[PDB]
Every structure is written in C-alpha cells, then in structure tokens.
Amino acid sequence: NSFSGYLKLTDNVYIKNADIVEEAKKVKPTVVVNAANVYLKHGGGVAGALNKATNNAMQVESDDYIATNGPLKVGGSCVLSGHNLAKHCLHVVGPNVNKGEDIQLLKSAYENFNQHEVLLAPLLSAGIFGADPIHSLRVCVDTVRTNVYLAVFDKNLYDKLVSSFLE
Numbered sequence: 001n002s003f004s005g006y007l008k009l010t011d012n013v014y015i016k017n018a019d020i021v022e023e024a025k026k027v028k029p030t031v032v033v034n035a036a037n038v039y040l041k042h043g044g045g046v047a048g049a050l051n052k053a054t055n056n057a058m059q060v061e062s063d064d065y066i067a068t069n070g071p072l073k074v075g076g077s078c079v080l081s082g083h084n085l086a087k088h089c090l091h092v093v094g095p096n097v098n099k100g101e102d103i104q105l106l107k108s109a110y111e112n113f114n115q116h117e118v119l120l121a122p123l124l125s126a127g128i129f130g131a132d133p134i135h136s137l138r139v140c141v142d143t144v145r146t147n148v149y150l151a152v153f154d155k156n157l158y159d160k161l162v163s164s165f166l167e
C-alpha cells in the first residue's frame with residue numbers, strides 16, 4: 001500500500017491523476033477495485049485495462065465465477081484474485097445510466113468498499129457509464145468510510161474534480 005503523489009481530500013479519500021493499472025503495479029495494494037458489469041465481461045475501459053495487465057487471467061477466473069454463481073446485481077460486488085496487480089480484486093457494478101440504470105444505486109456500489117480497510121479504485125460509473133463524475137466523487141466521499149485511493153486517468157477531469165470539491 002505504498003501510495004505516492006495523491007492529494008488528500010478528506011480523512012479517508014485521496015485522489016491522483018493516474019492510470020489505475022500503473023498504480024496497481026507501483027503500489028501492490030491489498031485490494032484493487034474493478035469497474036465491472038454484471039457478467040464480468042472485461043471488454044474495454046477500466047475493466048479491459050486491468051484484465052489485459054493480468055494477460056487475460058482475470059477474464060478466465062471471472063467466467064468461472066459466473067458459471068458457478070450467476071451474474072452480479074447492479075450495486076453489488078464480488079471478491080476474486082488480484083493476480084499480479086493486487087492481493088484481491090473487488091469487482092463492483094455501478095449503474096450504467098446510459099443504459100437506464102438508477103443513479104441511486106451508485107451509493108450501494110460504493111458501500112461495497114467499506115468491507116476492505118484500504119483500496120485502490122476508479123471513479124465508479126464515470127466515463128461511458130454516463131454518471132456525472134463530480135456527483136460520483138461526492139457519493140464516494142459521503143459513503144466510503146474506509147481508506148480509498150482514487151486513480152482518475154485524465155488530467156482535465158482530475159483538475160475539475162479537485163476544483164469542484166475545494167469550492
């Protein structure tokens with residue numbers, strides 16, 4: 001958990017302009033969070049980047065989990081191996097508002113982070129999931145009580161999030 005160069009926003013929420021994959025390699029965190037979908041198909045974006053960094057081992061393990069347990073619910077999670085990136089990967093499904101899922105489930109999604117003391121995570125439901133990223137940060141700050149290190153891979157978005165939170 002050797003996180004470096006983060007800006008502390010609250011007593012338990014930190015943020016950095018960084019690729020979550022690059023952070024996982026440098027930090028070797030106990031838990032890395034994946035911004036998953038309910039069938040754990042890691043086809044692009046954050047999930048695709050994390051899966052590619054495990055040389056597809058995450059996707060094979062995920063298919064085996066789904067075969068035995070069925071899909072997740074929106075707002076839910078599962079703990080699987082972290083492979084070479086972390087001890088564990090916490091796969092969390094935030095709502096995809098571009099597909100009509102309820103934005104209120106973003107609170108349920110962040111609540112899954114409270115079962116782990118320290119996490120490296122992405123900004124849930126941002127990007128192509130369509131949630132307002134400033135709203136996602138506010139729900140993270142209001143809901144997560146354990147120590148969360150957010151990696152946002154876009155300097156422009158990083159700067160807007162820090163400005164909107166320090167207002």
Ligand SMILES: CC(C)[C@H](Nc1ncnc(N)c1Cl)c1ccc2c(c1)S(=O)(=O)CCC2
Nearest residue numbers: 019020035045046123125126127128153154
């Ligand atoms: C807002 C983006 C800059 C951010 N991207 C990243 N943030 C950190 N490490 C990365 N490798 C990337 Cl790709 C982001 C955060 C959340 C989500 C996505 C994108 S998505 O479009 O893959 C859909 C699922 C939710």
